[PDB]
Ligand binder design. Structure first.
Ligand code: MG
Ligand code: MG
Ligand code: MG
Ligand code: MG
Ligand code: MG
Ligand code: MG
Ligand code: MG
Ligand code: MG
Ligand code: MG
Ligand code: MG
Ligand code: MG
Ligand code: MG
Ligand code: MG
Ligand code: MG
Ligand code: MG
Ligand code: MG
Ligand code: MG
Ligand code: MG
Ligand code: MG
Ligand code: MG
Ligand code: MG
Ligand code: MG
Ligand code: MG
Ligand code: MG
Ligand code: MG
Ligand code: MG
Ligand code: MG
Ligand code: MG
Ligand code: MG
Ligand code: MG
Ligand code: MG
Ligand code: MG
Ligand code: MG
Ligand code: MG
Ligand code: MG
Ligand code: MG
Ligand code: MG
Ligand code: MG
Ligand code: MG
Ligand code: MG
Ligand code: MG
Ligand code: MG
Ligand code: MG
Ligand code: MG
Ligand code: MG
Ligand code: MG
Ligand code: MG
Ligand code: MG
Ligand code: MG
Ligand code: MG
Ligand code: MG
Ligand code: MG
Ligand code: MG
Ligand code: MG
Ligand code: MG
Ligand code: MG
Ligand code: MG
Ligand code: MG
Ligand code: MG
Ligand code: MG
Ligand code: MG
Ligand code: MG
Ligand code: MG
Ligand code: MG
Ligand code: MG
Ligand code: MG
Ligand code: MG
Ligand code: MG
Ligand code: MG
Ligand code: MG
Ligand code: MG
Ligand code: MG
Ligand code: MG
Ligand code: MG
Ligand code: MG
Lengths: 64, 96, 76, 52
RNA sequence: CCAUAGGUUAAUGAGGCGAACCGGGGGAACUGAAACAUCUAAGUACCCCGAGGAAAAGAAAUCAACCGAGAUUCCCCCAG
RNA sequence: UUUUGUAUAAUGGGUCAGCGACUUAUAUUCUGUAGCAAGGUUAACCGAAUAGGGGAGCCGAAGGGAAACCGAGUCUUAACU
RNA sequence: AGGACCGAACCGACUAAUGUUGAAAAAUUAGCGGAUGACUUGUGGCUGGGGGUGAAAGGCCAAUCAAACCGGGAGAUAGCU
RNA sequence: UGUAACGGGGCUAAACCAUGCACCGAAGCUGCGGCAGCGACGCUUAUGCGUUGUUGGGUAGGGGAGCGUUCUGUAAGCCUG
RNA sequence: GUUUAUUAAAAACACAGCACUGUGCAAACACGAAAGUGGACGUAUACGGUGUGACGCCUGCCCGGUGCCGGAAGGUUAAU
RNA sequence: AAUUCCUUGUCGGGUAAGUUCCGACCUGCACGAAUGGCGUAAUGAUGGCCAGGCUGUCUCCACCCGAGACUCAGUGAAAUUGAACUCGCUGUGAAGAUGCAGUGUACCCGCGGCAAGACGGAAAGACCCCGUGAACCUUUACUAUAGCUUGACACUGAACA
RNA sequence: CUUUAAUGUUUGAUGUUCUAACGUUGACCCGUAAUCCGGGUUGCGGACAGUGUCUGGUGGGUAGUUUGACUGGGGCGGUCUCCUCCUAAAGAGUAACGGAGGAGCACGAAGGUUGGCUAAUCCUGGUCGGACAUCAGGAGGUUAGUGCAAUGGCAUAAGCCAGCUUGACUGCGAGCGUGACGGCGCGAGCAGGUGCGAAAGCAGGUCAUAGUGAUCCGGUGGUUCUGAAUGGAAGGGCCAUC
């Protein structure tokens, strides 16, 4: 049979041009009056998945 | 994705975005695909006959990728700025 | 008993030593107080972190009447 | 944790708001600060409203 | 009371068996979730009923998208 | 065999003969190899038929953005040194 | 008269010894309890598994019982050997 | 349990200290011969051949190269009363 | 008298008695999706459940908790 | 005390001597009145204690009668078993050695006996821990649920107040 | 509107009675050769009861399961995140059921800036006034201070007063620190707009290091980004936030 995509991981990652994955940062969903505005501003843009945990992402997303 | 009992990376991270249904019925066209049609006119129905965009597509842009040499009338499709300069330099006539 | 606690090691110290060429913005020393002090082309952070404001080699030196230790970036 | 948290609604008509805390026991009067409003790009007086 | 229930004949038919396939009436749990209750296993196993050489479905109160297609069933795609 | 470590007084086997354990299917990725090459390839099915037909599709030659949309750029932002 | 007494058949099983790959997957030998009663026995019947039945020991339900047996889900699962 | 606190015999040095020259002693090193790996370099490569250095204990594990077995093609061939 | 067939026969179970409580008969209760059946072809001197356990002398205080029974003015409260 | 931790409580009886027994005491760790209290004739293959009779129970065994064991003839198992050319000691060592070191002793092979060792045989320890194992069991654990119960609507109508 | 009646109908609530649904495990008749059943006559009951759907309570009667780890064995006890010091062997890091202490906040000024100021203690003198208030002199030199633990800082004070204020700004961020990662931290400069200062300048919270919680689901405001024929809308997205 076909491999099934981990459908939770398909809602968290998008493949970029050279094959890396972008994702939204954590810690920006709730409890926000105590966080500095400098801290939040560096959490709005999407970041790339680091090299260590990039192996687990590809296993969850076989169809890119 | 099992990391031991640690909360895995695909669940530590938040969901984001949505899926656009309108994006599935759009397509992008090389300039090299403009010569592959016949008659020198480009419609939605001409490109589907040339097996370029596919049947369910309803919107298409022409992109500066590849190159065109023959004069080609583009009709009813969006064109980027670099593709507009490249089509009109080779003798084309972009219209609607 | 009563003595199980300790905190995480905050990894302070001197990150770039003397005669060591850095880029602007490079952290030189992390420290609690101003155990070191900021000299020429060196800024002092919010948590008393000493970073380089320009590019060049690190110079440790002792100046002033109180014999305090100043860190400066020589030009390069 | 007696220090409750509030929000400072812009008086420039925009719904923009800064969020902060106050001790409502010792400071019953409302907090009003003149803060920057990034939508109108001016410094406008903000007034305290309930965080709701 | 008529009547009806009931009774007695007569005629025709049914009954029972059989591997799978089919339609229907019922319908688990182990298991997976690294526990587990929603969920999964799965309308699966099993039980029951009925049928045929196949059954079932089937001739739009259907799709589509302002262009159109034109009953049902099956296969490859669409597409993990 | 298991172990930090076994002549171990730790496990297993009386012996012989025969059997006895990393497979299969489909997806996917990588490497090798071969065919073609900005293209490559067909699936059911037809076909008398391992041919030929069939290009429905799939992958690739463009990306960015949550998205509309823009496009060798794009997003962020009122605007980016 | 008697859930009376002593005591064989019959029913039971208190103690010891033997036996423990036995003669026997619970018996023999010497003693022992009840022995007209809530007794014992033949034949046939009925109660079915989360159920029976139990003068109640979680006892018994075909040498198996804190949920029988047989077949099926089934190659349950086993981070263990 | 039996000498049983030099391994024993035994030793008044065959003990200890100092100094010296010998010798023994390993699968270390050297000699001789053989195989292989990886690098150099050159060849005139048959895509590996001289020379040349150097390497060659090994579990888990990774990589490279093979042997043999049954079956199919080669094979109505070849071997075989 | 009974009991762990196959390591326990006992002080354990049972027992006559006693008490509490349920039950008016299509009884309570029990087995049954239900029909029914047992109780019982019985009828409160009867039947079920529970505790105690011949007989003799006796069985004291506590209703706050937990149950059960009775109450129905108020508060709260479901579908609708 | 079927209950008493301290405890072999103390006192009395019994005995030459009594942690048990019997009678008292009350200081009841932590009895107690139908999960009954205290008595109680009779009964018990019931528990503890004492006495008489009796005796191989014993001091301390002796002999005898039979059935085996032993020998011959016939038949003929079993558990176990890596391989054996299968000694003692002291030491060593996966830390308790027939097998290692040192040393001592020992001709080769049966048969009848004994059971100290072969960490002897039998049963993948039941104890203990572990497994995100199982099973039954309990309850004011969680979530359900049969059953019981409440009301609304339906089956379900007519009058009058 | 304040203050309440009339008339009629508008349906409930409780008596109040009836029979025709329904019940009858009353009698009698018939099917019948029958204590079942059904039919019939009749009596009693009667819209109650009883069943269906919905619903509240009750519910170990029954069922599915859960019931943590570390641990000089397990249980018992203690512990579990975060900060500070020691152990830590002069970079970083470094364990134990090792030795000692804290945190789960506070502050609209205790922030920003400009201006100014400098402690503890002791001595002597002085109304109440005393070991100790306040005042004046002197020694002393931070032995004080820091909203709170410890450590490192702190006189240019980061300590202490006053004036004006909101930079406790929004968008960004070269370059580094620190982690397996999620993440956390430091940051000159740039754009906008602002405060203080004459000005140079300083300000993206506080002397620094504790004062904390991922994702999902859901709420609120903002935003046409999306809107399943089309126009809306619902819902979703993005931004802020709970
Ligand atoms: Mg949000
Ligand atoms: Mg966890
Ligand atoms: Mg096509
Ligand atoms: Mg399940
Ligand atoms: Mg599971
Ligand atoms: Mg048909
Ligand atoms: Mg039409
Ligand atoms: Mg083994
Ligand atoms: Mg072991
Ligand atoms: Mg071991
Ligand atoms: Mg060894
Ligand atoms: Mg041995
Ligand atoms: Mg062994
Ligand atoms: Mg073992
Ligand atoms: Mg063995
Ligand atoms: Mg390939
Ligand atoms: Mg290729
Ligand atoms: Mg008798
Ligand atoms: Mg018996
Ligand atoms: Mg006998
Ligand atoms: Mg007798
Ligand atoms: Mg028991
Ligand atoms: Mg049995
Ligand atoms: Mg069963
Ligand atoms: Mg079971
Ligand atoms: Mg299964
Ligand atoms: Mg199995
Ligand atoms: Mg000796
Ligand atoms: Mg010498
Ligand atoms: Mg060598
Ligand atoms: Mg050689
Ligand atoms: Mg070697
Ligand atoms: Mg090797
Ligand atoms: Mg062959
Ligand atoms: Mg008796
Ligand atoms: Mg027995
Ligand atoms: Mg017995
Ligand atoms: Mg009855
Ligand atoms: Mg009793
Ligand atoms: Mg009483
Ligand atoms: Mg009460
Ligand atoms: Mg009361
Ligand atoms: Mg009540
Ligand atoms: Mg007691
Ligand atoms: Mg005692
Ligand atoms: Mg005596
Ligand atoms: Mg005495
Ligand atoms: Mg005695
Ligand atoms: Mg006494
Ligand atoms: Mg008692
Ligand atoms: Mg009582
Ligand atoms: Mg009693
Ligand atoms: Mg013989
Ligand atoms: Mg020998
Ligand atoms: Mg030894
Ligand atoms: Mg012998
Ligand atoms: Mg022996
Ligand atoms: Mg013997
Ligand atoms: Mg032994
Ligand atoms: Mg053994
Ligand atoms: Mg075991
Ligand atoms: Mg249960
Ligand atoms: Mg389960
Ligand atoms: Mg544990
Ligand atoms: Mg312990
Ligand atoms: Mg260090
Ligand atoms: Mg060091
Ligand atoms: Mg301060
Ligand atoms: Mg100042
Ligand atoms: Mg300040
Ligand atoms: Mg501070
Ligand atoms: Mg969740
Ligand atoms: Mg629409
Ligand atoms: Mg729109
Ligand atoms: Mg619509």
């Amino acid at each position: 049979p076909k491999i099934k995509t981990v459908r939770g991981a398909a809602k968290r990652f998008k493949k970029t041009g050279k094959g890396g994955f972008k994702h939204k940062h954590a810690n920006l969903r709730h409890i926000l009056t105590k966080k500095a505005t400098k801290r939040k501003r560096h959490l709005r843009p999407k970041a790339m998945v680091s090299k260590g945990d990039l192996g687990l992402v590809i296993a969850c997303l076989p169809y890119a | 994705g099992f990391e031991g009992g640690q909360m895995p990376l695909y669940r530590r991270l938040p969901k984001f975005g949505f899926t656009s249904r309108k994006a599935a019925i759009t397509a992008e066209i090389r300039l090299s695909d403009l010569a592959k049609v016949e008659g020198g006119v480009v419609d939605l129905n001409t490109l589907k006959a040339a097996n370029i965009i596919g049947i369910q597509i309803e919107f298409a842009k022409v992109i500066l990728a590849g190159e065109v040499t023959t004069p080609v009338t583009v009709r009813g499709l969006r064109v980027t700025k670099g593709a507009r300069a490249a089509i009109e330099a080779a003798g084309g006539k972009i219209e609607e | 008993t009563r003595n199980g606690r300790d905190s995480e090691a905050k990894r302070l110290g001197v990150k770039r030593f003397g005669g060591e060429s850095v880029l602007a913005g490079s952290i030189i020393v992390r420290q609690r107080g101003t155990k070191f002090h900021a000299g020429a082309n060196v800024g002092c952070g919010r948590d008393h972190t000493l970073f380089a404001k320009a590019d060049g080699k690190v110079k440790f030196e002792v100046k002033g009447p109180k014999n305090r230790k100043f860190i400066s970036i020589e030009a390069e | 944790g007696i220090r409750e948290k509030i929000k400072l609604v812009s008086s420039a008509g925009t719904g923009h708001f800064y969020t902060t805390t106050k001790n409502k026991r010792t400071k019953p009067e409302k907090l009003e600060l003149k803060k920057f409003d990034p939508v109108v790009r001016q410094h406008v007086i903000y007034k305290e409203a309930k965080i709701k």
